[PDB]
């Protein structure tokens, strides 16, 4: 009866340290573990009972009744269960209080079979194809109290990913792991709640099938994993709103999840270029020198950034008349050179200036845009400018005011996007200047494992008021709501695609904005940790993600910055950013051989931009990932499941970086197939013929291993110091043949920044096909945007025998080279991407 296998013991004292007497008083078992809870539920612990189950066209409804109270206050004894079979792939169920509207996240919204346990109550979801049990909520009691919801399930395996934002391996440890979702300003460190919260997991099943679970709940929560294996959702409010996505492919699970929360926004092409920033570019002169120094040293740079330096007394929508007197001229110059400009914006608005002295506050105050406290005044905290109020991005008037402030500032300085920092929201003091009241929201009955042990730590009072609800319910949305507000602000101000990079995020963030991983240390550990974190954000539908290249905190080393630039060049969002007291880490600040390695990394990224842009097109229209783990592409190969120090770009490009000091080789996993060394493509084995195995590759300091998968064609474009320049260059194809002489690839092209391109059909889509010693294009769509793209080079990999002749459209080509050593046929052509062509050899 208390004979429960240790791994299957669910914690009956998650709220407090408990004694054997108190444990047995709750009706629970007390056995010290030989981590595993000492106080755990017997199989007979009171749960809810399923009653009055009925079927309809939509699905199932029932009453859940609890007869015996839990040890939490304000149990809701009568619940309503609603099970909705929404699509062949998507099962949706809610557990609500039929007597009272409870807080619900404001979001726009067969392969499975379902059965129920009566007592204790449980929802059971099978995969129809194989009968396997994916969800089973019968494993532990259902808790549904006003400020404590708990729902548990068996997991189909020890392999589960998601539940951002945390510094951890891509596959979460099931050894009694507590994962806390409570947006918190803190330098990434293991076991801590970080800047964002994504209550979604993808679970692998034996044989490489997978399913996803989304809990649509924005309250502070713990998610507890145990090695049985099983999971417990423990939220501090709202309702249980659960989506199950049946896959069966992991990539299909992600796409199914993004169907609900939104497909990733399409970035502007210039956004995929190199970004350079630091805190400490203290003048326009200094900032101009950065661009001059990069250009002088032949380093590509699309976007020049500034941190707090530009502001007047660290206030939004101002610039100082000292070092930044000619701010408008500097940004206009950047535009004249073909570059874009980004600057930091904080959420908090300085409240200390005399009335009428600082328009953002004076206007915000008048229009009631700010989060208000117990006595109905603006909540005042402390951030960079001093005393600040915090905008309420759930208030329609705050959205109008934010659009107005962005538009007015844009009329003075025409910035090309917004870097939105400190939007947890971050507070330099606890709660407010005036502290926080003593109520159940500030002092809840269950406090998740947050750093500082309070919901108020490094943020604003939980009982503060927003237009939609209390901060208690909306805190984990704050960053997301600012990203939506800023997305709209930039569309109205500029009339082209917005570019928003946000620190704080929630599920569905990728539909509006991108993300950077925050204040990472300049360390080999943080370089390695950035790979799983960038992969995690792609799975969560935020493909536009990166870490500060060479690290933010402390001083980078020349070797670290070389390796970090090499890997960082494969971040979908590539920015080098640096702290105020740090040594310079711009590419031009290093030795000649280091610069050479960093220039080579940047050159290769720029060459690949047409490919990377096409991958973002697939993310935007089909909910695909851009940077993906090997297990998303080869899920039926179980050796990929734990790989998170390699990444793919889409299906085809395998990046195997060095992540350790003093290494001149690296060992990476190579799924079954032929992998051609990308170094054999003009811009050490020529080809790795893998059975599905680990392979040691040479990797001197000037090298990063990149391999192109046999069966794939990649589009490339010639060099430039900006995408303004690069987008005008001739293009090339890299054609990686299967042993059987086949390959496939694609190109998406548009003007690179207009809104509603897909709706208006203002794009070109071309498919490339290799077969039987031929390469053709298929024209899916050709418009003015793309029709004049010049193809001048076709490189074919895995050409076994030297050709006697190479033909372009039936005519011998002007020039070609064949290397018998590397099996590479390099062909010079004069073709248009938008006109049907046929290249052949024999
Ligand atoms: C909700 O937010 C509002 C701000 O939007 C906040 O108002 C603040 O209230 C405190 C008092 O509660 C104000 O502080 C006072 O300032 C005046 C004038 O400078 C002082 O004279 C007051 O001093 C008295 O109290 C001191 C305690 O140390 C004593 O030392 C002294 O002898 C006085 O007896 C006091 O410091 C503060 O100015 C406002 N803030 C603003 C911007 O107006 C309100 O408190 C918040 N409500 C809740 C319940 O938190
Ligand atoms: C969903 O999860 C629940 C709980 O984990 C599963 O129900 C439990 O199944 C166990 C193992 O079969 C049952 O214990 C067994 O009971 C029989 C007597 O009926 C005994 O002979 C065995 O030695 C064993 O102890 C247990 O009664 C049952 N628990 C509850 C609370 O009902 C269930 O199987 C899962 N559903 C699916 C479809 O996997
Ligand atoms: C990061 O490095 C700076 C600067 O260090 C100095 O200059 C470099 C080029 C290199 O030659 C170093 O060996 C030098 O020490 C550090 O700033 C220094 O901090 C100490 C202590 O406050 C002070 O005595 C030095 O004079 C400072 N130099 C300057 C220019 O301010 C900084 O502390 C380093 N940070 C970390 C985390 O290691
Ligand atoms: C851009 O490069 C110039 C030239 O390398 C930098 O100016 C030099 O700065 C060093 C200190 O690092 C001084 O010793 C020299 O006096 C400067 N040389 C010249 C030729 O002026 C400048 O700091 C760089 N600016 C930025 C922002 O990187
Ligand atoms: O705008 C400044 C900045 C760094 C702040 C670092 C700091 C914070 C508090 C005390 C001292 C330093 N904010 C936080 C951002 O993560 C980082 O990229 C920025 O450079
Ligand atoms: Cl035991
Ligand atoms: Cl007992
Ligand atoms: Cl108790
Ligand atoms: Cl969408
Ligand atoms: Cl102040
Ligand atoms: Cl909203
Ligand atoms: Cl389309």
UniProtKB/Swiss-Prot annotation:
Lineage: Eukaryota, Metazoa, Chordata, Craniata, Vertebrata
Outcome (variant: residue 358 to F): In POMPE; juvenile form; almost complete loss of activity
Recorded superkingdom: Eukaryota
Gene field: GAA
Binding site for substrate: 307, 503, 519, 577
Result of changing residue 592 to K: In allele GAA*4
Glycosylation, residue list: 52, 136, 293, 373, 555, 772, 815
Effect of mutating residue 23 to G: In POMPE; infantile form; severe; loss of activity; shows enzyme localization primarily in the ER-Golgi compartment suggesting that mutation could affect the normal processing and stability of the enzyme
Outcome after substituting residue 478 to S: In POMPE; juvenile form
Disease annotated for this entry: Pompe disease: An autosomal recessive metabolic disorder with a broad clinical spectrum. The severe infantile form presents at birth with massive accumulation of glycogen in muscle, heart and liver. Cardiomyopathy and muscular hypotonia are the cardinal features of this form whose life expectancy is less than two years. The juvenile and adult forms present as limb-girdle muscular dystrophy beginning in the lower limbs. Final outcome depends on respiratory muscle failure.
Class of this enzyme: hydrolase
Family to which this protein belongs: Belongs to the glycosyl hydrolase 31 family.
Name of the protein in question: Lysosomal alpha-glucosidase
E.C. designation(s): 3.2.1.20
Signal among keywords: yes
Disulfide bonds: 2-29, 12-28, 23-39, 436-461, 550-561
Impact after mutating residue 381 to R: In POMPE; severe; loss of activity
Reported impact of residue 482 to K: In POMPE; infantile form; severe; loss of activity
CC terms in the record's Gene Ontology section: autolysosome lumen; azurophil granule membrane; extracellular exosome; ficolin-1-rich granule membrane; intracellular membrane-bounded organelle; lysosomal lumen; lysosomal membrane; lysosome
Function: Essential for the degradation of glycogen in lysosomes. Has highest activity on alpha-1,4-linked glycosidic linkages, but can also hydrolyze alpha-1,6-linked glucans.
Active-site residues (renumbered): 421 (nucleophile), 424
Effect on the protein upon substituting residue 211 to P: In POMPE; infantile form; severe; complete loss of activity
Reaction catalysed by this enzyme: Hydrolysis of terminal, non-reducing (1->4)-linked alpha-D-glucose residues with release of alpha-D-glucose
Mutation effect (residue 455 to P): In POMPE; infantile/juvenile form; severe; loss of activity
GO BP annotation list: aorta development; cardiac muscle contraction; diaphragm contraction; glucose metabolic process; glycogen catabolic process; glycophagy; heart morphogenesis; locomotory behavior
Result of altering residue 502 to Y: In POMPE; no residual enzymatic activity
């Amino acid at each position: 009866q208390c004979d429960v296998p240790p791994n299957s013991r669910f914690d009956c004292a998650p709220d407090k340290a408990i004694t054997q007497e108190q444990c047995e008083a709750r009706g629970c078992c007390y056995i010290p573990a030989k981590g595993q809870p000492w106080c755990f539920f017997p199989p007979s612990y009171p749960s809810y009972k399923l009653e009055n189950l009925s079927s309809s066209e939509m699905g199932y409804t029932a009453t859940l009744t609890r007869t015996t109270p839990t040890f939490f206050p304000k149990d809701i004894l009568t619940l309503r269960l609603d099970v909705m079979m929404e699509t062949e792939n998507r099962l949706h169920f809610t557990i609500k209080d039929p007597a009272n509207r409870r807080y619900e996240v404001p979001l726009e919204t067969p392969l499975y079979s379902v059965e129920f346990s009566e007592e204790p109550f449980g929802v059971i979801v099978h995969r129809q194809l194989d009968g396997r049990v994916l969800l089973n909520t019968t494993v532990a009691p259902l808790f549904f109290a006003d400020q404590f919801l708990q729902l548990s399930t068996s997991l189909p395996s020890q392999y589960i990913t998601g539940l951002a934002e945390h510094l951890s391996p891509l596959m979460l440890s099931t050894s009694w792991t507590r994962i806390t979702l409570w947006n918190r300003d803190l330098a990434p460190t293991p076991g801590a709640n970080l800047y964002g919260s994504h209550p979604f997991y993808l679970a692998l099943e034996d044989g490489g099938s997978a399913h996803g679970v989304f809990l649509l709940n924005s309250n502070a929560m713990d998610v507890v994993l145990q090695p049985s294996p099983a999971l417990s959702w423990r939220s501090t409010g709202g309702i249980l709103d659960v989506y199950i996505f049946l896959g069966p492919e992991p990539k299909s699970v992600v796409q199914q999840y993004l169907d609900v929360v939104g497909y990733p926004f399409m970035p502007p092409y210039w956004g995929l270029g190199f970004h350079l920033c630091r805190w400490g570019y203290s003048s326009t002169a200094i900032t101009r020198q950065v661009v001059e120094n990069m250009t002088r040293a032949h380093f590509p740079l699309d976007v020049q950034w500034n941190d707090l330096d530009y502001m007047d007394s660290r206030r939004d929508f101002t610039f100082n008349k000292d070092g930044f007197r000619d701010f408008p001229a500097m940004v206009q110059e950047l535009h004249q050179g073909g570059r874009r400009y980004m600057m930091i914006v904080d959420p908090a608005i300085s409240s200390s200036g005399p009335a009428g002295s600082y328009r953002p506050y004076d206007e915000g105050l008048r229009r009631g845009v700010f989060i208000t406290n117990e006595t109905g005044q603006p909540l005042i905290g402390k951030v960079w400018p001093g005393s600040t109020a915090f905008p309420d991005f759930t208030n329609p008037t705050a959205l109008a005011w934010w659009e107005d402030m962005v538009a007015e500032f844009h009329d003075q300085v025409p910035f090309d996007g917004m870097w939105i920092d400190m939007n947890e929201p971050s507070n330099f003091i606890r709660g407010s200047e005036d502290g926080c009241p003593n109520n159940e929201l500030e002092n809840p009955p269950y406090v998740p494992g947050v750093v500082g042990g309070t919901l108020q730590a490094a943020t604003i009072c939980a009982s503060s008021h927003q237009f939609l609800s209390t901060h208690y319910n909306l805190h984990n949305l704050y960053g997301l709501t600012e990203a939506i507000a800023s997305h709209r602000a930039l569309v109205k101000a500029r009339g082209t695609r917005p570019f928003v990079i946000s620190r704080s995020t929630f599920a569905g963030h990728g539909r509006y904005a991108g993300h950077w991983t925050g204040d990472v240390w300049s360390s080999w550990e943080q370089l390695a940790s950035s790979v799983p974190e960038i992969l995690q954000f792609n799975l969560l539908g935020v493909p536009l993600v990166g870490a500060d290249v060479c690290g933010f905190l402390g001083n980078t080393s020349e070797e670290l910055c070389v390796r970090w630039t090499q890997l960082g060049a494969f971040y979908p969002f590539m920015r080098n950013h640096n702290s105020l007291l740090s040594l310079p880490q711009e590419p031009y600040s290093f030795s000649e051989p280091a610069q050479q390695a960093m220039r080579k990394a940047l050159t290769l990224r720029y060459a690949l931009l047409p490919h990377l842009y096409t991958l973002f097109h697939q993310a935007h229209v089909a909910g695909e990932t851009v940077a993906r783990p090997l297990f998303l592409e080869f899920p039926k190969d179980s050796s990929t499941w734990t790989v998170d120090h390699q990444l793919l770009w889409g299906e085809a490009l395998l990046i195997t970086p060095v992540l350790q000091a003093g290494k001149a080789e690296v060992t990476g996993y190579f799924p079954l197939g032929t992998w051609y060394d990308l170094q054999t493509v003009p811009i050490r084995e020529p080809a790795i013929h893998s059975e599905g195995q680990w392979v040691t590759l040479p990797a001197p300091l000037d090298t990063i291993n990149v391999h192109l998968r046999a069966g794939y064609i990649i589009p490339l474009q010639g060099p430039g110091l900006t995408t303004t320049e690069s987008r005008q260059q001739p293009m090339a194809l890299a054609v990686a043949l299967t042993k059987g002489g086949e390959a496939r690839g694609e190109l998406f092209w548009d003007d690179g920044e207009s809104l509603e391109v897909l709706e208006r059909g203002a794009y070109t889509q071309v498919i490339f096909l290799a077969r039987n010693n031929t390469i053709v294009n298929e024209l899916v769509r050709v418009t003015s945007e793309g029709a004049g793209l010049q193809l001048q080079k076709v490189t074919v990999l895995g050409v076994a025998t030297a050709p006697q002749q190479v033909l372009s459209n039936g005519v011998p080509v002007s020039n070609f080279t064949y290397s018998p050593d590397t099996k590479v046929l390099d062909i010079c052509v004069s073709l248009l991407m938008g006109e049907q062509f046929l290249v052949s050899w024999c």
